[PDB]
Design an enzyme around this catalytic site. Sequence first.
Site, PDB file in Angstrom:
ATOM      1  N   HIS A  73      31.018  45.383  34.096  1.00  0.00           N
ATOM      2  CA  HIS A  73      31.527  44.596  35.224  1.00  0.00           C
ATOM      3  C   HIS A  73      31.426  45.365  36.545  1.00  0.00           C
ATOM      4  O   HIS A  73      32.410  45.643  37.228  1.00  0.00           O
ATOM      5  CB  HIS A  73      32.960  44.155  34.936  1.00  0.00           C
ATOM      6  N   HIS A  77      26.042  43.620  37.523  1.00  0.00           N
ATOM      7  CA  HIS A  77      26.413  42.319  36.979  1.00  0.00           C
ATOM      8  C   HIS A  77      26.628  41.310  38.098  1.00  0.00           C
ATOM      9  O   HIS A  77      26.190  40.161  37.992  1.00  0.00           O
ATOM     10  CB  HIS A  77      27.676  42.457  36.124  1.00  0.00           C
ATOM     11  N   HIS A 113      32.730  37.480  42.330  1.00  0.00           N
ATOM     12  CA  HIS A 113      33.504  36.902  41.230  1.00  0.00           C
ATOM     13  C   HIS A 113      34.129  37.948  40.312  1.00  0.00           C
ATOM     14  O   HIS A 113      35.065  37.612  39.577  1.00  0.00           O
ATOM     15  CB  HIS A 113      32.641  35.937  40.413  1.00  0.00           C
ATOM     16  N   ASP A 114      33.651  39.203  40.347  1.00  0.00           N
ATOM     17  CA  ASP A 114      34.237  40.246  39.502  1.00  0.00           C
ATOM     18  C   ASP A 114      34.641  41.487  40.294  1.00  0.00           C
ATOM     19  O   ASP A 114      34.783  42.558  39.699  1.00  0.00           O
ATOM     20  CB  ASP A 114      33.277  40.672  38.373  1.00  0.00           C
ATOM     21  N   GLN A 282      26.921  39.468  18.677  1.00  0.00           N
ATOM     22  CA  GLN A 282      26.050  38.740  19.598  1.00  0.00           C
ATOM     23  C   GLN A 282      25.647  37.388  19.020  1.00  0.00           C
ATOM     24  O   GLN A 282      25.638  36.378  19.734  1.00  0.00           O
ATOM     25  CB  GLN A 282      24.795  39.564  19.921  1.00  0.00           C
ATOM     26  N   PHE A 285      28.622  35.173  19.243  1.00  0.00           N
ATOM     27  CA  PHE A 285      28.744  34.871  20.669  1.00  0.00           C
ATOM     28  C   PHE A 285      27.809  33.737  21.066  1.00  0.00           C
ATOM     29  O   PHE A 285      28.229  32.752  21.689  1.00  0.00           O
ATOM     30  CB  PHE A 285      28.438  36.142  21.469  1.00  0.00           C
TER      31      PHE A 285
HETATM   32  C1  LIG Z   1      29.872  39.558  21.912  1.00  0.00           C
HETATM   33  C2  LIG Z   1      30.295  39.169  23.300  1.00  0.00           C
HETATM   34  O1  LIG Z   1      29.280  39.639  24.194  1.00  0.00           O
HETATM   35  C3  LIG Z   1      29.425  39.415  25.532  1.00  0.00           C
HETATM   36  C4  LIG Z   1      30.589  38.917  26.096  1.00  0.00           C
HETATM   37  C5  LIG Z   1      30.677  38.721  27.469  1.00  0.00           C
HETATM   38  C6  LIG Z   1      31.935  38.162  28.078  1.00  0.00           C
HETATM   39  O2  LIG Z   1      32.569  37.219  27.134  1.00  0.00           O
HETATM   40  C7  LIG Z   1      33.765  37.760  26.718  1.00  0.00           C
HETATM   41  C8  LIG Z   1      34.597  37.261  25.719  1.00  0.00           C
HETATM   42  O3  LIG Z   1      34.269  36.124  25.029  1.00  0.00           O
HETATM   43  C9  LIG Z   1      35.121  35.818  23.919  1.00  0.00           C
HETATM   44  C10 LIG Z   1      34.878  34.417  23.448  1.00  0.00           C
HETATM   45  C11 LIG Z   1      35.772  37.962  25.439  1.00  0.00           C
HETATM   46  C12 LIG Z   1      36.124  39.121  26.122  1.00  0.00           C
HETATM   47  C13 LIG Z   1      37.417  39.850  25.816  1.00  0.00           C
HETATM   48  C14 LIG Z   1      37.300  41.303  25.347  1.00  0.00           C
HETATM   49  C15 LIG Z   1      36.861  41.448  23.910  1.00  0.00           C
HETATM   50  O4  LIG Z   1      37.796  40.902  22.988  1.00  0.00           O
HETATM   51  C16 LIG Z   1      35.274  39.586  27.127  1.00  0.00           C
HETATM   52  C17 LIG Z   1      34.094  38.912  27.407  1.00  0.00           C
HETATM   53  C18 LIG Z   1      33.026  39.185  28.436  1.00  0.00           C
HETATM   54  C19 LIG Z   1      33.633  39.002  29.815  1.00  0.00           C
HETATM   55  O5  LIG Z   1      32.678  39.076  30.866  1.00  0.00           O
HETATM   56  C20 LIG Z   1      29.598  39.055  28.272  1.00  0.00           C
HETATM   57  C21 LIG Z   1      28.422  39.563  27.721  1.00  0.00           C
HETATM   58  C22 LIG Z   1      28.329  39.753  26.351  1.00  0.00           C
HETATM   59  O6  LIG Z   1      27.230  40.233  25.691  1.00  0.00           O
HETATM   60  C23 LIG Z   1      26.110  40.630  26.478  1.00  0.00           C
HETATM   61 MG   LIG Z   2      35.061  37.827  35.439  1.00  0.00          MG
HETATM   62 ZN   LIG Z   3      31.337  38.188  35.408  1.00  0.00          ZN
END
Ligand SMILES: CCOc1cc([C@H]2Oc3c(OCC)cc(CCCO)cc3[C@@H]2CO)ccc1OC
Ligand SMILES: [Mg+2]
Ligand SMILES: [Zn+2]
Lengths: 324, 324
Positions: A73, A77, A113-114, A282, A285
């Site tokens: 962050h 980014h 935004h961050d 991933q 995700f």
């Molecule tokens: C495997 C996840 O990869 C990624 C996740 C993210 C974002 O998404 C979540 C998130 O989504 C949960 C549904 C949760 C938490 C909380 C901290 C951990 O519990 C934090 C984040 C990030 C914030 O910018 C960005 C890139 C990623 O990969 C390149």
């Molecule tokens: Mg953010």
């Molecule tokens: Zn962001």
Amino acid sequence: QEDVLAKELEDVNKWGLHVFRIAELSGNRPLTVIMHTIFQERDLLKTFKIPVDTLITYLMTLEDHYHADVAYHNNIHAADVVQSTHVLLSTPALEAVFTDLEILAAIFASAIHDVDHPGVSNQFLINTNSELALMYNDSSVLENHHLAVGFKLLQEENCDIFQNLTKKQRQSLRKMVIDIVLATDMSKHMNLLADLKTMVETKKVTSSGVLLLDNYSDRIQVLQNMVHCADLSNPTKPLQLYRQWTDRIMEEFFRQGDRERERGMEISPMCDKHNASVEKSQVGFIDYIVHPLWETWADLVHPDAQDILDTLEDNREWYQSTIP
Amino acid sequence: QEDVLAKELEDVNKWGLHVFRIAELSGNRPLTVIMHTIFQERDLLKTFKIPVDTLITYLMTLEDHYHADVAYHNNIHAADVVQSTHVLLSTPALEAVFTDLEILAAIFASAIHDVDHPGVSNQFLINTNSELALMYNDSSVLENHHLAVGFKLLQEENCDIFQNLTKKQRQSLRKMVIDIVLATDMSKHMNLLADLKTMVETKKVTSSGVLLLDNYSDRIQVLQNMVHCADLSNPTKPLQLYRQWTDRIMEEFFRQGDRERERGMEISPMCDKHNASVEKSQVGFIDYIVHPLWETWADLVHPDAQDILDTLEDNREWYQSTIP
Ligand SMILES: CCOc1cc([C@H]2Oc3c(OCC)cc(CCCO)cc3[C@@H]2CO)ccc1OC
Ligand SMILES: [Mg+2]
Ligand SMILES: [Zn+2]
Ligand SMILES: CCOc1cc([C@H]2Oc3c(OCC)cc(CCCO)cc3[C@@H]2CO)ccc1OC
Ligand SMILES: [Mg+2]
Ligand SMILES: [Zn+2]
């Protein structure tokens, strides 16, 4: 090496910009140089009478308030989300859907935004009784802070890039920027996707297939989902970029999980470096968050998000193949 | 004098408590003495193992952070809302409905709900680009600030009145208090009242005759509307109290309007002392805001609030009679 920096920036209109190379060539100023280039490409400096020196002074100040010791962050980014939003704004299905002020709000919101992100989650800040969570009453703690810093920096010397906006233009932009950045809170993802889906079903388009959004409520919802998509665009990028973003978010996750371990708290999901599977994370995700979001978006802009969606599906297949 | 104060505090369970007299007799400590009385009356010190010295220290610190130089949004108003909430919580239709923790949350929320109020509106703070509005992104600016201050003061020396609650109790109390104070934002009144009307229309009553509230949403909604009613209870009070509250709010309105006028801003409704009708404004306030709210609350707890509603209606008739 400004000519290769200039050569890299000529792809500012393309999904898959070499943002990390631009970060290195620009002396760790990707946010400044990419924002400058986008404001020129869209002619926003004289559409809104922004003095170029005021643009640069603010952008450098803003970039300085992103932390250099957080792996994900940071200003890279921020620059990436700005550029991804810039590309999504040029989606043919959205041709001239948004006013120049709405375009300006989405781009400014992406840049701030961050800002001043500490590299830990809202839940961490809440569960640790942080000063930020106390100020913001546990509600969109980081996103409220990003906005407050982003706007406060306009009050530094020669930083008011909105000085020549009318008072109504400034009030409208402020409201839109707040609405967009608050929507980047990940806890609002499902509500935001549900509203994107509703707009897909009730979608109205011209004969060419260009979207018709008459209500401000609908237009801000699209801009919210747009910047949310750009925030969650790493898995849709060329793999060489995506893998770097995965390395960086996992560094942040693990360092947070260490703190949850040293303090003795419950380790957040994917934050335990001793029981983590980066690749399975991933894929999940993508399967549960990123693909449902980008396939709904692709439908709203049908069929214009096919190349982006194709990359995402390619990248999901590759990450799955790294799982034995 | 302490003799007389003790006698007046015997009325703490009654609508129409002599709160201005208590403020004088207590040496301008109405919030501290009324909160202490209510906590003893409800056995909250014993239940939650609150050291009496800690309670008094916190209450005096909290009371200090109300502005003694604002005519309405001061420690007397806070004491009045606390005591009004205390009476509404004892209504027969709610007997044994709320837990001790929910009772503690409602009373604590009432006590902190306007702390550090500057005597001007959210809109004034937004329109003057105040530091508060910048901190809170123009969203429930005052109410977020009241919460942050009220919680922050618990960290001062010998001020953590919740030191012996379990972590789960503290987490639950904090969320309920935030939900309650944020609902005192007047911009939320119409949605709050709409939901209260929906609840009355669909209300269920136990075999004991009390309201049935079996989920968090319904329980917090009732507490939100309870404290909002207490906040908007001045016109339901005996006329000699109501008229003092009207004098005080009009002083704040007129002072805000003087600031708006000097700044060249549009003067807020009812804030122009050269163009205001105090009596017409009270009748309109009752007709469009206070009576709709209180009539709906009275329906929820029927017939417990009939005398309160009768007083409101008498006071509306009285103010109306002064206009012709
Ligand atoms: C495997 C996840 O990869 C990624 C996740 C993210 C974002 O998404 C979540 C998130 O989504 C949960 C549904 C949760 C938490 C909380 C901290 C951990 O519990 C934090 C984040 C990030 C914030 O910018 C960005 C890139 C990623 O990969 C390149
Ligand atoms: Mg953010
Ligand atoms: Zn962001
Ligand atoms: C005639 C109104 O009398 C009263 C109004 C109020 C509150 O209710 C409003 C409000 O509600 C709409 C009227 C609007 C503004 C904004 C500033 C003025 O534009 C401010 C307030 C007050 C905040 O505590 C309390 C007591 C009153 O009388 C005893
Ligand atoms: Mg208030
Ligand atoms: Zn109040």
